Amino acid sequence: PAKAVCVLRGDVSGTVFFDQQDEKSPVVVSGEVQGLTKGKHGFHVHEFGDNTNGCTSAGAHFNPEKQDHGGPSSAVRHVGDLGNIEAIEDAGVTKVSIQDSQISLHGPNSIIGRTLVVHADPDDLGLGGNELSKTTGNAGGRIACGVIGLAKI
Amino acid sequence: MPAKAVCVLRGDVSGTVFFDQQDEKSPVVVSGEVQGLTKGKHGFHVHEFGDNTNGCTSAGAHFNPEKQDHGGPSSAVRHVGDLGNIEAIEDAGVTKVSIQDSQISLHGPNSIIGRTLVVHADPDDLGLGGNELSKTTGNAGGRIACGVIGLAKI
Ligand SMILES: [Cu+2]
Ligand SMILES: [Cu+2]
Ligand SMILES: [Zn+2]
Ligand SMILES: [Zn+2]
Known part of the structure; x- marks a missing residue:
């Protein structure tokens, strides 16, 4: 089994873990982010x-399959598309609790050594009908980020 | 194909370190620099x-997939992560990093992608110290800066 971790640096902080039981299984993404403004925040x-x-310098969304931007449930999406994390209040602690089958900690879709980014605005899941929507989801500025690194166990 | 990675060091000192590998089978070339080191040798792993x-x-111990004891980069017995010392020629300057190593890789069992580069307060004794710490940490002491090694653009 594999584990990775990202410690966010920027306007918000937090530790996000990535757990994967087998090369075939999805990745479970957990942890917590602090200091988010109330509302939805793009997460890729x-x-x-x-x-x-x-x-x-993190570049664009991780996109080994050469697709346009979407939500994690979109038929068309970037491998790096993890949707929104949502703060229910201002200045609270947002739980991160995601599972995704596209990302992996092994192979061509491996996210080891790549960057997790939190955005200022909501990811529109590519439904804004403009060029920005198909690329960034109109998520706006990158407010925090970190390199995804191998973690203990 | 050719691979590149980068690490931004943060802490008591700072710097940017690049890693380049032409082939899965060639050595890794490490370049960049570290700013603010006190004169003398500083452990680097x-x-x-x-x-x-x-x-x-929380970066843990030296990267050690081959289950060995600590040494210098030229030691027959070393950790894959063992890159020896960087030496500041003066106080408060910029120290050039210029290393080539064949144990570390950007691919495979020995890939350092997603691991941490650490600069230390004291010299690494390359496992020629007369104590238990020598064979494990090289007596390099405090971790004064570190960063995660990440994939970088071609
Ligand atoms: Cu993003
Ligand atoms: Cu070290
Ligand atoms: Zn995207
Ligand atoms: Zn060592």
């Missing part, structure tokens, strides 16, 4: 684990 | 976890 794995230029 | 949950402490 971006291609590069590069923070030489803050979250900007 | 890849640690096993890319885990920053408890600062550089």
Whole structure:
């Protein structure tokens, strides 16, 4: 089995774990984010684990299958598309509790060494009918991010 | 195909370190620099976890897939993560990092992607110290900066 972790750096903080039991099974993504503004926040794995230029150098959404942007349940989506995490209140602690079959901790869809990004605005899941929607989901600015690294156990 | 990775060091000192590998079978070339080191040798290793949950402490021990004891990069017995020392020629300067190693890789069993690069306060004795810590940490002491090693653009 495999485990990875991301510690967010930026306007919000938090520790997000990734657990995968077998190469064939989905990845369970858990942990908590603190200091999010109330509301929905876009949440994606971006291609590069590069923070030489803050979250900007993370590049675009991780997209090994060469698709347009969507939500995690969209028929068309980036592998890195994990939708929104939602703060129910201002200045609280948002639980992260996601499972996804596209991302992996092994092989071509492996997210090890890539970057988890939290956004300022809601991910519209690619339903905005413009170029931005098909690329970023109009999630706006990158407010925090971290490189996804191998974790204990 | 050719691979690249990068690590941004944060802590008491800072820096950016690049890793380049032409082939899955070629050595890894490590370049970049570290700013602010005190004059002298400073231990420099890849640690096993890319885990920053408890600062550089949670990066765990030196990356060691071959189950060996600590040494320098040229030691017959070493950790894969053992990259020896970086040496600051002056106080408060910028130290060039210029290393090539064939044990570390950006692919496979020995891949360092998703692991942590750590700079230490004291010199790594390359496992030629006369105590138990030598054969494990090289007596490099405090972890003064670290970063997770991430994939970088071609
Ligand atoms: Cu994003
Ligand atoms: Cu070390
Ligand atoms: Zn996307
Ligand atoms: Zn070692």
